Amino acid sequence: ELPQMVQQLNSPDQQELQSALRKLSQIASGGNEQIQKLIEAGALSPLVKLLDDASEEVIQEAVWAIANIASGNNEQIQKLIEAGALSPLVKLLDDASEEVIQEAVWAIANIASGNNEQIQKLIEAGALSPLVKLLDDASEEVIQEAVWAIANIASGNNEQIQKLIEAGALSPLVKLLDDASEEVIQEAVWAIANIASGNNEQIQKLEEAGAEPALEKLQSSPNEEVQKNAQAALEALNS
C-alpha cells in the first residue's frame, strides 16, 4: 500500500492527493520504525516537492508529515536534508500562515536536535535570521517553538553560536528571560546557558546584551532546571 500512497503524491485529483498525504502523516507520527518505511518507500523527495507549488491545505499536511519525519533519528534527519527539505522549510517562515509557520518551526527545531553538521546545514539554508525575527512579532505558541530551535542551534559549536549572535539572537533572548510564560523563560534560559559555554568574545556579547541582571532574577526561581541554567550561565559571565 506504501508504493501506491507514494505515487498518489503527484496525482492531479486533490482528494486522492490529500488522502495519501493524511495516510503518510499518520505513518510519519508512528515512530522511527514507521519513518524508516517512508524513507525506504521513497516518500521523502515527493513530500518535500509538495512545499513549492501546492495549495495551503496540501502544504499544512506535508509540513506536519515532514516535522514528524524530523522527530526520527539523526540518519533519518539526514535523509530529510538530502531530500532538499531545509530550503522550503526556511522559506515558509517568511510568508506562510501562522498555522504553517508553527509547523515549519517545529520541523526546524527537530532538525536542530540532530548533529552539528545538520545544525550547519540549517544555518547554510538561512534559518537563523527568520527564527530570530519570530522571537518578537510571532504568537506565544510560535515563540515557544522558535526558542527551542534557537536553544538547539546554540548547543552547536562555537562557530555556530557566533552565527546566532550575528543573526541578532542575544537581545530578544535576554528579553525572553522575563517573558509572561514560564515555558518561554525555561527555553530562553536554556538557550542563554548554551551561549554562555562559548568563547570569551561571546560571553562579552552576552554581558553587553544585559544577561547578568536578567539571570540573577532567575536564581530565585521555583523551577529547578531554570535555577541550574541561570547559575551555570552566571558562573561563565563571572569566570
Partner: peptide, 8 residues
Amino acid sequence: KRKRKRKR
C-alpha cells in the same frame, strides 16, 4: 555540557 534535546 551543551544541552541538545528532541521536541516531542
